[PDB]
Every structure is written in C-alpha cells, then in structure tokens.
Amino acid sequence: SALGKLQDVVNQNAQALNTLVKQLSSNFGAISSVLNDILSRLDPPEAEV
C-alpha cells in the first residue's frame, strides 16, 4: 500500500474507461441500447429518432 498514490491514479483511470464501456449498455430513452438491433428492427423514419 506504500505506493497507493500511484495505484490510485492507475485505478482511477481504469474506472473511467470501464464506466465508459458500460455506458454503451444504456438505452438513454431509446427502445434498445444496441444500434444493430435498432437498425434491424426499424426503418430510417424512426431509426433516426
């Protein structure tokens, strides 16, 4: 634990990236968090929304 200050930094960065990746799993109000599913299920008129 002596070098925690360094480890913290590393850890912090990792967390950031990790959260970013997990943010791809959110719908944000859409009907699905997967772009491919939306493209496979809807035509451009509503796929655009």
Partner 1 sequence: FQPTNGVGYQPYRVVVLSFELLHAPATVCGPKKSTNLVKNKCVNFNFNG
**Residues binding partner 1 (CB under 8 A):** 37, 40-41
What is the distance between the alpha carbons of residues 23 and 37, in angstroms, rounded to a whole number? 17
Nearer Cβ to partner 1, position 13 or 27? 27
Closest approach of Cβ 37 to partner 1, in Å? 6
Nearer Cβ to partner 1, position 14 or 39? 39
Nearer Cβ to partner 1, position 15 or 40? 40
Using CA atoms, how far residue 20 sits from 7, 10, 14, 42, 46, in Å, is 20, 16, 10, 26, 26
| Entry field: residues in the chain | 49
